[PDB]
Each structure stands twice: as C-alpha cells, then as structure tokens.
C-alpha cells in the first residue's frame, strides 16, 4: 500500500523554470487523489478529457507530472490548442490531451523586492514545438553575415529572457507554479489506481 | 516528512585526527542539505551550504561530501575547540526539518 510521491512534486521548494521543465515519471502507485480535494488554495483544477469527480476510481499505467513557473497571465496558455509564448516556444500540449492542469499563486514564496532573475523563459524558435518536448538550446541565434562569437549585440540575440518577479507587479503578473498531470493508458496492465 | 537519521549518536575522538559523520535521508534530496554546529547553549552557525560549498568565516578544514540520500561530513585535523553537537537539516521538500543531531566530544 505504498503511496506514490505527489509530495515530492507538489510542496517542493525549487520548481525549475519553464524552458527546462523537470518531468517525474510516476509508476506503481496507489494514488490517493483525495489529498488534493482537501487542499483548498488551488486556482484551477481543470481536466481535459477526464472528469474530476471520477478521477479516483479509474486506472492508468503511467502518469507524468511536469512542473514549471509561469506568469499568472500565461496560465491561460497551458491548454489543448492555445497558442502564445509558453505553448509555442516553451511547453505545448497535444489536442487529444487526457490529463489535468493545476495552478498556484506563489507570490509569497518566489519573489524578492529585487528582481528574482533566476526564472527564465524562451523568446523564440525557428519552428514551433512538437508537443511534450523541452528545448535547452543555449546559444545565440545569429541569422547574419557576422559571427559574433558568443557575445550579444546587434543582430545577435540571446534566446532566454528573464522575469522580474517582484511582489508588487500584479495579480496576473506574480508567478504561478503550474503542475501538469498527463495520464496515459498504453497497452499494459494497470498499476496506478486506488 | 523527510526524517533524517544521524549515526552514531555519540563519538569518542582525540585531537589531531579525522572523523566522519552520516546523515541518511529518506527521499532523494540532491545537494539541498546543510550542516550546522552547536556548542553548549549558543546559536548554531552555518558550516557548509548545499552539501559541498564552504562558508567564509569558518576555518578551512570542514568539508563534507556525498549526494543522493547518504551524506557524510568529513572534518580533518580536529581540534579541541570543535566540541559540540552537529546538525544536518534538509531543504528540498516541505516543511524543512533538521536531524536528530550527534555530538563530538573529546577523549
């Protein structure tokens, strides 16, 4: 009756930034989602393809739990089909999505009065992301005759801009920790239940 | 939570030697564990941040190693003024919690 680690991915200290989202492959559960339904402060308990009230009783094989930190405005982009900056260059979901999306309001925990410049986000790519793919390419997009040899300048742009994350920006601009559960049922006897 | 056991509970050492401690975790806590030193009725000080890096102010002999779930604190050329009780305290999941603490006395 070993409980599977939602505690390692929900009340953690350091969520990674959105351009490199850490992904935990959860397996061999007896997954008790009733600890989520007693935790009050969730901004959005949205599920696409599955119902929230029948979530405890159905079985899966592997459940993936991603995690990142985005603006509170950009949560309206962690969704099947929506385009923007987070779902076009950082983290995109497929249109047959069968998981849930949970969001926080961590302005108390992820903000100093100075700029909390740890969290980064991607600005552009040469093509939009295939779904469920991370991109840690850290070099300057040249697109010119000039080899600028790794220092930023004219016609040489770094791809990762940084947030500020002060506690006085805005209720839609203070950082929202977002955890994306994505279930699956591929052709195997089920382990995740209970 | 993350219960952190330290073993052994007591030590019997002599000055001018090396000795090593242990702080075994429960879940995997990658380089987010710290070490604290407390003497008789004082405030604890910070010895090493983030399980490997040392702090300005302390002597340069305290340096612990290891990552994962098993962590050892290695002190070489121990002096007589290193008497006290040593605390390990994780930081990865919530809430933060400190170890049971083992003490380092003198022969």
């Amino acid at each position, epitope marked *: 009756t070993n409980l599977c680690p939602f505690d390692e991915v929900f009340n953690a200290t350091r969520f990674a930034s959105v351009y490199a989202w850490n992904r935990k492959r959860i397996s061999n559960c007896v997954a008790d989602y009733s600890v989520l339904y007693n935790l009050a402060p969730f901004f959005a308990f949205k599920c696409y393809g599955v119902s929230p009230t029948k979530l405890n009783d159905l079985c899966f094989t592997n459940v993936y739990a991603d995690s990142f930190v985005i603006r509170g405005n950009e949560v309206s982009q962690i969704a099947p089909g929506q385009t923007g900056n987070i779902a076009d260059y950082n983290y995109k979901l497929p249109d047959d999505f069968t998981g849930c999306v949970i969001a926080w309001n961590s302005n108390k*925990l992820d903000s100093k*009065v100075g700029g909390n410049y740890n969290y980064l986000y991607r600005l552009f790519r040469k093509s939009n992301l295939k779904p469920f793919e991370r991109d840690i390419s850290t070099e300057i997009y040249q697109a010119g005759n000039k080899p600028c040899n790794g220092v930023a300048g004219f016609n040489c742009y770094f791809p990762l801009r940084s947030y500020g994350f002060r506690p006085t920006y805005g209720v839609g601009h203070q950082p929202y920790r977002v955890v994306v559960l994505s279930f699956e049922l591929l052709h195997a006897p089920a382990t995740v239940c209970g | 939570d993350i219960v952190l056991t330290q073993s052994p509970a007591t030590l019997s050492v002599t000055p001018g030697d090396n000795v090593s401690l242990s702080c075994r975790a429960s879940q995997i806590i990658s380089n987010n564990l*710290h070490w604290y030193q407390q003497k008789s009725h004082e405030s604890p*000080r910070l010895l090493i941040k983030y399980a490997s890096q040392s702090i300005s102010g302390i002597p340069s002999r305290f340096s612990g190693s290891g990552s994962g779930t098993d962590f050892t604190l290695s002190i070489n050329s121990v002096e007589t003024e290193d008497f006290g009780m040593y*605390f390990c*305290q994780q*930081s990865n999941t919530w*809430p*933060l919690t*400190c170890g049971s603490g083992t003490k380092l006395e003198l022969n």
Partner: nanobody
Amino acid sequence: QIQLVQSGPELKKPGETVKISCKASGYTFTDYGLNWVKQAPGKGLKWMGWINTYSGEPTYNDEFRGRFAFSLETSTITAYLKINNLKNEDTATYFCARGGNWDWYFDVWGAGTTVTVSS
C-alpha cells in the same frame, strides 16, 4: 554588523499567553525571510514555519497549525511570535533564524529566549 538579538527570558503560568520579539538590524529586511525554530532541551530542532517579510503572512508547519501567530510590524524592524494557551511541554530556546527567500539555509541566528512554564 548583522545580528538578530531577541527579548530576554520569560516566565508564564499554564493558560497565559506570551509574546516573543525578534528585532533585525543591519540587513535590508525585505531581501530575506525569517524562520523560527523551537528546540526542546535534549532534543533536535523543529522548524516552526517562516514569515514572508514583505507582506507579513505566515506559513505554518503542520505541527504548529493553530495556536501560534507570526505577526509582523515593519515601522520598527521586528518580528513577533505569540503563543496562546501555554501547555506544559513547550519550554525551549525559541530562536529566530534568517533563511533566505531563495536559498533557505539559516546562517545568521539569534541568541534565543526561553519560555519555561510552572506555577
């Protein structure tokens, strides 16, 4: 010069409340957090839960869920701890340790006040 010197020892009866100060001086107060820890004699430290020094809202450990209050005034740079309905086991040396808003290691501590209970 960065230190957090608290109030002196207190002595209260079972049922009376207590109020413990923790005054900061030297560092910019909004740049870091404030963590409280309680250490019963002969035992290990226990984290009491921090307080975000900009807004002033607490975040309690689940052991000390109710019954405590990390209030905060910022006109004078002082944190506050208040224990309602004192019982007979929580005598300790209640420190207050500055752990960061991004790091969470407790480097600059305080001397520590002691609230024993008797009759």
